[PDB]
Write an enzyme that holds these catalytic residues in place. Sequence first.
Site, mmCIF file in Angstrom:
data_model
loop_
_atom_site.group_PDB
_atom_site.id
_atom_site.type_symbol
_atom_site.label_atom_id
_atom_site.label_comp_id
_atom_site.label_asym_id
_atom_site.label_seq_id
_atom_site.Cartn_x
_atom_site.Cartn_y
_atom_site.Cartn_z
ATOM 1 N N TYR A 76 42.548 -24.701 -35.870
ATOM 2 C CA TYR A 76 41.498 -24.527 -34.868
ATOM 3 C C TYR A 76 42.035 -23.805 -33.636
ATOM 4 O O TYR A 76 43.108 -24.142 -33.128
ATOM 5 C CB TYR A 76 40.971 -25.903 -34.472
ATOM 6 C CG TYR A 76 39.634 -25.948 -33.793
ATOM 7 C CD1 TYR A 76 38.457 -26.095 -34.536
ATOM 8 C CD2 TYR A 76 39.541 -25.896 -32.398
ATOM 9 C CE1 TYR A 76 37.223 -26.166 -33.910
ATOM 10 C CE2 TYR A 76 38.310 -25.953 -31.762
ATOM 11 C CZ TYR A 76 37.159 -26.085 -32.525
ATOM 12 O OH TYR A 76 35.945 -26.151 -31.897
ATOM 13 N N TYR A 119 31.443 -23.068 -34.292
ATOM 14 C CA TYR A 119 30.555 -21.928 -34.535
ATOM 15 C C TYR A 119 29.141 -22.134 -34.008
ATOM 16 O O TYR A 119 28.602 -21.233 -33.375
ATOM 17 C CB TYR A 119 30.482 -21.567 -36.020
ATOM 18 C CG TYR A 119 31.734 -20.965 -36.618
ATOM 19 C CD1 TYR A 119 32.488 -19.997 -35.936
ATOM 20 C CD2 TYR A 119 32.138 -21.337 -37.896
ATOM 21 C CE1 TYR A 119 33.628 -19.446 -36.512
ATOM 22 C CE2 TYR A 119 33.272 -20.799 -38.478
ATOM 23 C CZ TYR A 119 34.008 -19.856 -37.784
ATOM 24 O OH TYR A 119 35.119 -19.324 -38.372
ATOM 25 N N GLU A 173 40.183 -18.292 -40.165
ATOM 26 C CA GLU A 173 39.537 -18.280 -41.485
ATOM 27 C C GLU A 173 40.321 -17.467 -42.503
ATOM 28 O O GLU A 173 40.411 -17.852 -43.668
ATOM 29 C CB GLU A 173 38.078 -17.816 -41.425
ATOM 30 C CG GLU A 173 37.166 -18.650 -40.534
ATOM 31 C CD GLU A 173 36.857 -20.063 -41.026
ATOM 32 O OE1 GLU A 173 37.472 -20.559 -41.996
ATOM 33 O OE2 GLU A 173 35.975 -20.693 -40.401
HETATM 34 N N1 LIG Z 1 37.477 -22.629 -31.994
HETATM 35 C C1 LIG Z 1 37.346 -22.748 -33.311
HETATM 36 N N2 LIG Z 1 36.168 -23.112 -33.848
HETATM 37 C C2 LIG Z 1 35.997 -23.254 -35.172
HETATM 38 N N3 LIG Z 1 34.797 -23.643 -35.635
HETATM 39 C C3 LIG Z 1 34.559 -23.792 -36.953
HETATM 40 C C4 LIG Z 1 33.293 -24.248 -37.352
HETATM 41 O O1 LIG Z 1 32.415 -24.407 -36.502
HETATM 42 N N4 LIG Z 1 33.169 -24.721 -38.615
HETATM 43 C C5 LIG Z 1 31.919 -25.354 -39.102
HETATM 44 C C6 LIG Z 1 31.894 -26.826 -38.627
HETATM 45 O O2 LIG Z 1 33.089 -27.499 -39.035
HETATM 46 C C7 LIG Z 1 31.801 -25.242 -40.643
HETATM 47 C C8 LIG Z 1 30.611 -25.804 -41.160
HETATM 48 C C9 LIG Z 1 30.664 -27.018 -41.865
HETATM 49 C C10 LIG Z 1 29.498 -27.589 -42.391
HETATM 50 C C11 LIG Z 1 28.273 -26.934 -42.216
HETATM 51 C C12 LIG Z 1 28.207 -25.722 -41.520
HETATM 52 C C13 LIG Z 1 29.377 -25.155 -40.995
HETATM 53 C C14 LIG Z 1 35.605 -23.549 -37.852
HETATM 54 N N5 LIG Z 1 36.866 -23.144 -37.380
HETATM 55 C C15 LIG Z 1 37.059 -23.007 -36.054
HETATM 56 C C16 LIG Z 1 38.299 -22.621 -35.528
HETATM 57 O O3 LIG Z 1 39.268 -22.383 -36.247
HETATM 58 N N6 LIG Z 1 38.438 -22.488 -34.142
HETATM 59 N N1 LIG Z 2 42.122 -29.406 -32.162
HETATM 60 C C1 LIG Z 2 40.796 -29.429 -32.172
HETATM 61 N N2 LIG Z 2 40.123 -29.545 -33.336
HETATM 62 C C2 LIG Z 2 38.773 -29.572 -33.371
HETATM 63 N N3 LIG Z 2 38.128 -29.693 -34.554
HETATM 64 C C3 LIG Z 2 36.775 -29.722 -34.628
HETATM 65 C C4 LIG Z 2 36.110 -29.851 -35.856
HETATM 66 O O1 LIG Z 2 34.928 -29.510 -35.968
HETATM 67 N N4 LIG Z 2 36.831 -30.409 -36.851
HETATM 68 C C5 LIG Z 2 36.307 -30.629 -38.218
HETATM 69 C C6 LIG Z 2 35.990 -32.115 -38.449
HETATM 70 O O2 LIG Z 2 37.117 -32.936 -38.111
HETATM 71 C C7 LIG Z 2 37.312 -30.113 -39.274
HETATM 72 C C8 LIG Z 2 37.357 -28.712 -39.294
HETATM 73 C C9 LIG Z 2 36.458 -27.985 -40.089
HETATM 74 C C10 LIG Z 2 36.505 -26.586 -40.103
HETATM 75 C C11 LIG Z 2 37.462 -25.920 -39.329
HETATM 76 C C12 LIG Z 2 38.364 -26.634 -38.534
HETATM 77 C C13 LIG Z 2 38.314 -28.031 -38.524
HETATM 78 C C14 LIG Z 2 36.028 -29.628 -33.449
HETATM 79 N N5 LIG Z 2 36.690 -29.503 -32.219
HETATM 80 C C15 LIG Z 2 38.034 -29.474 -32.179
HETATM 81 C C16 LIG Z 2 38.704 -29.356 -30.959
HETATM 82 O O3 LIG Z 2 38.098 -29.272 -29.891
HETATM 83 N N6 LIG Z 2 40.102 -29.329 -30.954
#
Ligand SMILES: Nc1nc2nc(C(=O)N[C@H](CO)Cc3ccccc3)cnc2c(=O)[nH]1
Ligand SMILES: Nc1nc2nc(C(=O)N[C@H](CO)Cc3ccccc3)cnc2c(=O)[nH]1
EC number: 3.2.2.22
Length: 263
Positions: A76, A119, A173
Site C-alpha cells: 500500500y 481507490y 498493482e
Molecule cells: N494508497 C493505496 N491505495 C490502494 N487502494 C486499493 C484499493 O482501494 N483496493 C480495493 C479495496 O481494497 C480493491 C477492491 C476490493 C473489493 C471490491 C472492490 C475493490 C488497492 N491498493 C492500494 C495501494 O496500494 N495504495
Molecule cells: N498501511 C496501510 N494499509 C492500508 N490498507 C487498507 C486496505 O484497504 N487494506 C485491505 C484490507 O485490509 C487489504 C488490501 C487490499 C488491496 C490492496 C491493499 C491492501 C486501507 N488503508 C490502509 C492504510 O491507510 N495504510
Amino acid sequence: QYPIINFTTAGATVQSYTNFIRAVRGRLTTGADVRHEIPVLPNRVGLPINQRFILVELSNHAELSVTLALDVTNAYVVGYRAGNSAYFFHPDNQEDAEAITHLFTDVQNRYTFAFGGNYDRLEQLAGNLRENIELGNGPLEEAISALYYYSTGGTQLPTLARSFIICIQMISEAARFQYIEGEMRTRIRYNRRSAPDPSVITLENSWGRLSTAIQESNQGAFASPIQLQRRNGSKFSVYDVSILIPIIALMVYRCAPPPSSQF
Ligand SMILES: Nc1nc2nc(C(=O)N[C@H](CO)Cc3ccccc3)cnc2c(=O)[nH]1
Ligand SMILES: Nc1nc2nc(C(=O)N[C@H](CO)Cc3ccccc3)cnc2c(=O)[nH]1
C-alpha cells in the site's frame, strides 16, 4: 534506513520498468513464505518497525523527484515526500498511524490528509473511475510533476487524486500482478497511454480475495470459485491456484500455512 528503489520515466523502456518492478518485489517479499510458487508478503503481526516500509523514488524527464512510501505487508502507498513536505493518507487504524511517524522523519512539513487512500475515495476526489484514467509512461511522468507541485498550489485536488491512482496501479498493482506489470510494459513499449481494461480492474479488485482463496485452498483447489474478467469483459472462472501462477506475483498474508501433509 528503509530500502530505496529508484525509477525514472525519463527514457523508460520495457527493460528499465521490468528491472524496477522486480526490485520492488524483492524488497517487499523476504523469501520466507512461498505457497504454490507464489510469494506471500510479511505478516503484520510482530513485524518490527525497521522492516515495515520501502521507499520508491520516482524521477521524471522534467527533472523532478517524489518518494512514495510503501507498506511491505500489503504494498500500500501510505504517503509521499516532495522536497520539504510529506503527505500521508488518513490511516485506517491506530497501528498504521503510529507506523507512519517513522517515515520521512527529517522533513520540514508533515501533513496527514483527511481522506483515506483507497481507490473508492481517490476516484470520488478525482471525479473519474480507474476505467477512465489513462495509464502509461506519459501519465506517470505527469503524475510525478503533479505530486511534486502540490504543496505550492499548482495541483488541483482532482489531479492529485488521479495522480495517486496512476502511481498505485503502475507500482503497487504491477508488483502484485505479473499480468498488470505486462499491461504496463505494453504501454511503455509503444509509448501509448490507455485506461485499464476490465481484466486489470477485476484483478485489482480481487487481490485480497485471491490471496485468501489461495491460502485457504485444499491443495490448491478453491472451495468457492472466483469470477474474473477477460479484456473484452466476459467472465473467467478461477477454481484453482494453478491458473494464477503466471498472473499473481505476491499475496497479502491472510492465514498461517497448513502443515505439508505428505503422502
Ligand atoms: N494508497 C493505496 N491505495 C490502494 N487502494 C486499493 C484499493 O482501494 N483496493 C480495493 C479495496 O481494497 C480493491 C477492491 C476490493 C473489493 C471490491 C472492490 C475493490 C488497492 N491498493 C492500494 C495501494 O496500494 N495504495
Ligand atoms: N498501511 C496501510 N494499509 C492500508 N490498507 C487498507 C486496505 O484497504 N487494506 C485491505 C484490507 O485490509 C487489504 C488490501 C487490499 C488491496 C490492496 C491493499 C491492501 C486501507 N488503508 C490502509 C492504510 O491507510 N495504510
